[PDB]
Each structure stands twice: as structure tokens, then as C-alpha cells.
């Protein structure tokens, strides 16, 4: 059982719209720190909301009595910023949060100390060629590198060390972490880079994918998100067409190249943002099924379901406007997309207790053997024009 350690109202800084919003936060003893539109009455807790292993800053700009939770989540540094009315309030909160976090590190260390089983056994920047900037965030950059000794290509995420201070995933369509090392002032993650090209480029050249082509890519995405949701208890919150690449054989790869940009331009890409993220509401696994819907609409229709060059009007489209479909789209596709793009997460396909299973049973995916998807036994509809892992057809 997870009991409430401290609860109350905070002003949460907004990333997309209203900048400062009052929210009712519960800090629980499992480490979750979650804000709601209103104080709630009564799913599985998401690690996205954990304060475990966070660092806590007090600050006075741009508002007095603000404080910051900074966490490293897998390979991404994220910052949550809050404001209270009195400095005494801020000390109650930072102290409660630290106490919950410390108690979590404590019981954890005692448990692994007790269970270590002759796992008590005791790479540098020079080893790599910089090739090309892939992204810059507030606390790091992501670069395409060539590992000198092997000639292989990787993305390297380079983080500022002082904002932070074997666990990989067995899913074939996620970005695997190859090495992790540190320098005197940096933490570097070396992760795989697919050389079958960017799906945004493939879609742009083909104009549209057939429903069957989109079915193949969507299935692989569904299987990766299911894995994240139910094995890792994390939501991705970053699904967009540009974060999908193909490997040398035509199988999907979801990239892990994102960096938060708060404090350097939105963080993500606005046209893929789910309504509950825009409004800074309580969100859960269902934000990813919204992202799946935007990506598959784009795949099957050749364009976005919501677009406007003015991001203020795009947000309004995302929040208010009902979705329209090209006249050629079939009804199973339409059923899938409008279920994925329900504005209310509570109504959204995948937004119920069953999560991915709701999508895997949708008649648009009928006939898919989900075990063969996970084992890469489905035959790719498109084989990219590379015949080696070190082939640079799709960068040069």
C-alpha cells in the first residue's frame, strides 16, 4: 500500500500554454509526485512521476519561493518547476520530498547490499569521431559519432555531469544503450543508430503508406510501447514521425535522442502533443496511444490530423476540433484512428485498464501474431537501400 506523505496545492510551471497553473499534488511513499486539476477522490504508478534520485533546487527567479525537481530519466534530464506562496511552505515541500527520496535510496541500498551474489566484482571521448549534431538541449547535446576502432555509427548523448550527480531493455524496436561512460565534466551515453533511414524521409518520398504498410509499422510501435508501459512502467511521451527510423532490414526503431529544452522553441513537436499534456493535466499511458494515432494518421493520410503554422491555433485544433478523414480511408483505419485520437484520455483506445491489449484486439490489427512481431518474424514491406551496418546511404 502507498500512503500519502504530503499533499496540497502548488503552482506548476507550464511548458506549452498557461505558464503557471495551480495543481493539487500528492507526494506518496513509493516516491510518486503527481499533480491533478482538482483534489482527487480515491492504474499502476508510472516511473515518470517518481522523485527517487532527484536533486532539489530552491530558486527565486522568475517567481519567489520556486523550487525545482531535476531527475535523470534513462538518458534524459528533466526538470519540474513549482511555486508556493511562502518560503516556509517551500521548505515543507522540499523537505518532505527529500525525506521520501532518502528513505527510498536507504531501503534500496540495504536490499541490494543484502542480495549481492559475487556481483561484487570491481571508453573515452578520444575513441570517437564527431560527425553531425543531432540535437541540443538545456543540459546536453546528442551527436552522431563513428566509433574509431570499429567504423560503426552511434548516437552519443552528452550531458552536463553536475546536473545529475546492464539495465538495458530487451525490446528490439527501442534504442539500445551500448556504452555509458563519464569524463571530468560530462556523462555520455552511446546508443545504437539505425542506418535504414528516417521514416519521415521515407513517408515524404512515398507520399503515403498503404494501410498494410502502416499496419506493420504500427504493430511494431504498439509492441514497443506495450513493453515500456507494462515492463518498465514508463510512458514515452515523445512519439512522432521524426523519432522513427528503420534499420538495415526495414524494421522500426524508436529513437532515444530527446533532450529537454526548458531554459536554453518548444520541448517536443507541438503537432504531436496530446491534449492532457497541453493543459498540463494528469496523464498516463494513454498519452502514448494519442501519439500512435497522430503517427498512423500521418502514415495513412499523408498529412497531420491537426496543423496550423500558428502554434496557438494548432493547440486549439488539438484541444477542440473533431478529426476529419481523407475520403479514401477505410473504416477499420477510421475506427482505429478516431479511437486513438479521442480527446479525453479516459475515453481513448488503450486508455483503459487493458492498455495495449485494447489496441492489439482492434480489428485493424486482426491477423497480427504479436509474438511474431516481437521476434521480428514479420516480413518488412520495405527493405531500405543498405546492405551493411556501416552503409551511410541515408546520412550522406
Amino acid at each position, epitope marked *: 500500500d502507498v500512503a500519502i506523505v504530503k499533499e496540497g496545492w502548488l503552482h506548476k510551471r507550464g511548458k506549452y500554454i498557461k505558464t503557471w497553473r495551480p495543481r493539487y499534488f500528492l507526494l506518496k511513499n513509493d516516491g510518486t509526485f503527481i499533480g491533478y486539476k482538482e483534489r482527487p477522490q480515491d492504474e499502476a504508478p508510472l516511473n515518470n512521476f517518481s522523485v527517487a534520485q532527484c536533486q532539489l533546487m530552491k530558486t527565486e527567479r522568475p517567481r519567489p519561493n520556486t523550487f525545482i525537481i531535476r531527475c535523470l530519466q534513462w538518458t534524459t534530464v528533466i526538470e519540474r518547476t513549482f511555486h508556493v506562496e511562502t518560503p516556509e511552505e517551500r521548505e515543507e515541500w522540499t523537505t518532505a520530498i527529500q525525506t521520501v527520496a532518502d528513505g527510498l535510496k536507504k531501503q534500496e541500498e540495504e536490499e541490494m547490499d*543484502a*542480495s549481492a551474489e559475487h556481483t561484487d566484482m570491481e571508453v573515452t571521448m578520444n575513441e570517437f569521431e564527431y560527425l553531425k549534431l543531432l540535437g541540443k538541449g538545456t543540459f546536453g547535446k546528442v551527436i552522431l559519432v563513428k566509433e574509431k576502432a570499429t567504423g560503426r555509427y552511434y548516437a552519443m548523448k552528452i550531458l552536463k555531469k553536475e546536473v545529475i550527480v546492464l539495465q538495458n531493455s530487451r525490446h528490439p524496436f527501442l534504442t539500445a544503450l551500448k556504452y555509458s561512460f563519464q569524463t571530468h565534466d560530462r556523462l555520455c551515453f552511446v546508443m545504437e543508430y539505425a542506418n535504414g533511414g528516417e521514416l519521415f524521409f521515407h513517408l515524404s518520398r512515398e507520399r503515403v503508406f498503404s494501410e498494410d504498410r502502416a499496419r506493420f509499422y504500427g504493430a511494431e510501435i504498439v509492441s514497443a510501447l506495450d513493453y515500456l508501459h507494462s515492463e518498465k512502467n514508463v510512458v514515452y511521451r515523445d512519439l512522432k514521425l521524426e523519432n522513427l527510423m528503420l534499420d538495415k532490414d526495414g524494421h522500426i526503431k524508436i529513437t532515444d535522442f530527446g533532450l529537454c529544452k526548458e531554459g536554453i522553441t518548444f520541448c517536443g513537436t507541438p503537432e504531436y502533443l496530446a491534449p492532457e499534456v497541453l493543459e498540463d493535466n494528469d496523464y498516463g499511458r494513454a498519452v502514448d496511444w494519442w501519439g500512435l494515432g497522430v503517427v498512423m494518421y500521418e502514415m495513412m493520410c499523408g498529412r497531420l490530423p491537426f496543423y496550423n503554422q500558428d502554434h496557438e491555433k494548432l493547440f486549439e485544433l488539438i484541444l477542440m476540433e473533431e478529426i476529419r478523414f481523407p475520403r479514401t480511408l477505410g473504416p477499420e483505419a477510421k475506427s482505429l484512428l478516431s479511437g486513438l485520437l479521442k480527446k479525453d484520455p479516459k475515453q481513448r483506445l488503450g486508455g483503459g485498464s487493458e492498455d495495449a491489449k485494447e489496441i492489439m484486439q482492434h480489428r485493424f490489427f486482426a491477423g497480427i501474431v504479436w509474438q511474431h512481431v516481437y521476434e521480428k518474424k514479420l516480413s518488412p514491406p520495405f527493405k531500405p537501400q543498405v546492405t551493411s551496418e556501416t552503409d551511410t546511404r541515408y546520412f550522406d
Partner: nanobody
Amino acid sequence: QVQLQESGGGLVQAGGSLRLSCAASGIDVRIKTMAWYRQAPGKQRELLASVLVSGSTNYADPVKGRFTISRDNAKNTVYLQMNKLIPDDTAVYYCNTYGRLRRDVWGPGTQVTVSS
């Protein structure tokens, strides 16, 4: 404070024996896998021996049959009995917990020197 302290090192002739002890204050050795390590003037630090909470022991090869690791719950201390010493054993010796090991926290260590 919160720390491990090694003692029992010194100069000793080849084939001889030495008993190293690691005294824990602020740490309970009953609750933690314990291990002994050593590091020589130019080389990597070497896992030597570990004892789980169950009492089961394990040894790296160049030491098996000559050293024995033991933990005495009463005096909150681990031991490393070192027998039939070879000058290839000359090093500074450290005991540690898993948690401290991953954080690279080390006690002062004790120097063992064997030559003849």
C-alpha cells in the same frame, strides 16, 4: 562515523600467513555481502573473496585454497585469513560492501608486503 577500517597488515616472509580484519562502525556486516579486494602499485583493483549473508564463500582463482574469508557477526567484522603467501600477494588490501563498491567509497586499506 559510518565507515570500514582495515587492520592487520605488515611485512611477512613468503609461505607465511597473515590475518586481516575489517571493522565496521555504523554499518552492520550481517545484512551485507562482504568482500575483500587488493590493489598493487601498477594494476587494477582485484576482487579476492566474498561472503554472502548466508555464509557461503567464493574465491577468485589465484587465492582459492590459501585464503579464507569469514564474517563474525558478534564483533561486526569480516576477516581474511591469508596462508602460504607468495610475493605476488604484495598489495594494499580493502574490504567493502556492494553499495560502497559501486559508489567507489573505500576505507584506508592495509598494506601486505611479502618478499624473500
